[PDB]
Amino acid sequence: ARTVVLITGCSSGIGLHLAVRLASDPSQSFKVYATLRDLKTQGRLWEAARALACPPGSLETLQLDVRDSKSVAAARERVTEGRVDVLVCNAGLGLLGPLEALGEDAVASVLDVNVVGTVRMLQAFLPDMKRRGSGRVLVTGSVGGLMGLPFNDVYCASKFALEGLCESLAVLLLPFGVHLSLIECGPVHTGSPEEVLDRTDIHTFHRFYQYLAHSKQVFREAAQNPEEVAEVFLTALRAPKPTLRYFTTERFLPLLRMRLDDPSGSNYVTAMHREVF
Amino acid sequence: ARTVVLITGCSSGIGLHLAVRLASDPSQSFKVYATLRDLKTQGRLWEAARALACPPGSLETLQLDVRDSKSVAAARERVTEGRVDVLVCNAGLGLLGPLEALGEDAVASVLDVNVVGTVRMLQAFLPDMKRRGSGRVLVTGSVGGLMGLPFNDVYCASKFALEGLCESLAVLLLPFGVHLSLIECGPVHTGSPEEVLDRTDIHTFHRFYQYLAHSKQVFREAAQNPEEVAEVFLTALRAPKPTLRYFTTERFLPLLRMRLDDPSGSNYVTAMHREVF
Numbered sequence: 252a253r254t255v256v257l258i259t260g261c262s263s264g265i266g267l268h269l270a271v272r273l274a275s276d277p278s279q280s281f282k283v284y285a286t287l288r289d290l291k292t293q294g295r296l297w298e299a300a301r302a303l304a305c306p307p308g309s310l311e312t313l314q315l316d317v318r319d320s321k322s323v324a325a326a327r328e329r330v331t332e333g334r335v336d337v338l339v340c341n342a343g344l345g346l347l348g349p350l351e352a353l354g355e356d357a358v359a360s361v362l363d364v365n366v367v368g369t370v371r372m373l374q375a376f377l378p379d380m381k382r383r384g385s386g387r388v389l390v391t392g393s394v395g396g397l398m399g400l401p402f403n404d405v406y407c408a409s410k411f412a413l414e415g416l417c418e419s420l421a422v423l424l425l426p427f428g429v430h431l432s433l434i435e436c437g438p439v440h441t442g443s444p445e446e447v448l449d450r451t452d453i454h455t456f457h458r459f460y461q462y463l464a465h466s467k468q469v470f471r472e473a474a475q476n477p478e479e480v481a482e483v484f485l486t487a488l489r490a491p492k493p494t495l496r497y498f499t500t501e502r503f504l505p506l507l508r509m510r511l512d513d514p515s516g517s518n519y520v521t522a523m524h525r526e527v528f
Numbered sequence: 529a530r531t532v533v534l535i536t537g538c539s540s541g542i543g544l545h546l547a548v549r550l551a552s553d554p555s556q557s558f559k560v561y562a563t564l565r566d567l568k569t570q571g572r573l574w575e576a577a578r579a580l581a582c583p584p585g586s587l588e589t590l591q592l593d594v595r596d597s598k599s600v601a602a603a604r605e606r607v608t609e610g611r612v613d614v615l616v617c618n619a620g621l622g623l624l625g626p627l628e629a630l631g632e633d634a635v636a637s638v639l640d641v642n643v644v645g646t647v648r649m650l651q652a653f654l655p656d657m658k659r660r661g662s663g664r665v666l667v668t669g670s671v672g673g674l675m676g677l678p679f680n681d682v683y684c685a686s687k688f689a690l691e692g693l694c695e696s697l698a699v700l701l702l703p704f705g706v707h708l709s710l711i712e713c714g715p716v717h718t719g720s721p722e723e724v725l726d727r728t729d730i731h732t733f734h735r736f737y738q739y740l741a742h743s744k745q746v747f748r749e750a751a752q753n754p755e756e757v758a759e760v761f762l763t764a765l766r767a768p769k770p771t772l773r774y775f776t777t778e779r780f781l782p783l784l785r786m787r788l789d790d791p792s793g794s795n796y797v798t799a800m801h802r803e804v805f
């Protein structure tokens with residue numbers, strides 16, 4: 252009857268706002284499983300759910316740790332309807348800093364949550380979709396998945412990885428009737444200094460500050476409401492033939508095109524260096 | 529005096545051929561540390577070294593496991609010259625199959641060797657390069673880093689990740705005088721069926737066969753000599769101002785451009801589906 256949606260990473264941000272947008276939809280078309288790594292963070296989702304007056308039974312929370320394939324399987328068994336019509340792979344971690352200041356565990360964690368975590372969800376959920384010959388997968392992407400950003404080396408690695416993962420899968424899934432799309436987000440309004448200085452050189456440290464200053468100004472001028480981003484997920488959801496990629500904004504497309512039409516990377520690296528520094 | 533080169537993944541392929549090309553250079557400009565995960569595989573490198581008559585002391589082998597930051601640090605201490613002029617990040621794993629048939633450990637291993645392994649090398653070696661204000665980093669890339677290939681979902685994820693990692697770093701390293709370049713390789717002439725069938729559906733299994741058939745024909749028609757690929761690394765090495773990206777072939781550039789100029793991904797996914805299936 253209803254469209255069953257399971258969303259990862261609902262404790263804040265896009266995931267939180269998408270979950271309550273869908274559950275509160277005036278048409279009541281959606282049953283939403285909002286999943287979270289730590290149940291102690293669920294308060295914010297329930298406060299938003301109340302604000303939007305989600306009908307009882309339109310929204311349920313599950314604990315799901317995308318690092319643990321047992322946790323993934325336990326949450327899938329909790330989908331009482333026995334299918335997922337829309338899977339939204341949104342859990343993700345950022346990681347910001349000079350590459351040599353990043354702990355090895357932090358690097359592996361970002362990769363595990365952002366890439367392997369999405370692999371675990373797709374392994375768990377794609378089979379029943381392929382069998383039914385139907386289902387929609389939406390994956391939260393980033394501008395940092397489409398072009399490299401300084402001091403985001405590992406975050407960008409992880410978001411570029413989701414691009415390759417999803418594009419590869421889409422080439423195969425086409426004749427199966429299962430549609431996968433990336434939702435490419437720019438900024439969204441959702442170590443300490445001594446720590447970082449201890450792990451890098453003064454010149455890199457200064458470039459980091461410059462990057463942070465520029466980033467803050469891009470964010471204050473350009474950040475989108477998660478309400479507006481969530482509606483782009485909805486657009487993808489309802490598209491009779493969805494495309495592989497949706498963009499939540501036109502903002503970064505000129506930078507992207509400059510990347511796109513000089514494959515040597517020389518124009519992009521130059522332009523981004525000037526843009527930031 | 530000599531240009532000190534440390535290359536990862538020298539047991540076969542590009543890494544093996546690049547190592548002996550450099551060590552055997554008639555000019556004797558290069559001292560090469562060819563590194564390998566398992567020393568039992570070093571025979572092939574030494575057979576090639578003899579064939580090309582590398583002078584004694586032009587080539588040394590080190591054991592290096594890019595999964596282990598202690599192994600990385602132990603090999604760096606073995607660079608008797610106390611600097612690395614050229615770091616070649618080439619170790620890599622493939623992974624081929626229906627996504628749901630891939631073991632979780634195999635997925636994590638590919639990511640660890642191909643992405644985190646390269647992060648470990650850059651963390652270990654970039655600091656002294658930035659300090660000197662000089663050094664060249666060359667990273668073995670792939671066509672699968674630039675466009676998604678069906679049944680290579682995790683391999684492509686890993687090779688897309690190297691793109692984001694390197695591009696992000698290049699934006700920063702520009703004013704430091706340290707130059708990083710990807711060398712984008714097409715095919716290079718360097719589970720059992722019951723296993724895979726047990727882990728997927730018959731229809732995906734059949735698409736896998738089709739992909740393998742097409743792949744084999746692309747390889748037989750298009751595979752390059754690693755001798756020819758190694759010379760593209762040399763070109764990058766010697767370029768007074770290197771670009772971010774070198775391509776070893778023009779072959780896949782029409783497919784890439786079609787990807788590049790439809791950001792929605794719709795033309796690429798369609799064209800690649802038709803190309804393979």
Ligand SMILES: C[C@]12CCC(=O)C[C@@H]1CC[C@@H]1[C@@H]2CC[C@]2(C)[C@@H](O)CC[C@@H]12
Nearest residue numbers: 394400437438439465466469470503526
């Ligand atoms: C990381 C930031 C800033 C913080 C964030 O939420 C993600 C966002 C993605 C767009 C980036 C931006 C930093 C400034 C950049 C790099 C602009 O120059 C162009 C794209 C911007």
Ligand SMILES: C[C@]12CCC(=O)C[C@@H]1CC[C@@H]1[C@@H]2CC[C@]2(C)[C@@H](O)CC[C@@H]12
Nearest residue numbers: 671677714715716742743746747780803
């Ligand atoms: C994985 C393969 C085949 C095996 C290999 O060594 C890597 C190589 C990269 C180019 C791929 C190719 C498979 C066939 C493809 C997908 C062609 O259609 C275009 C690019 C090709």
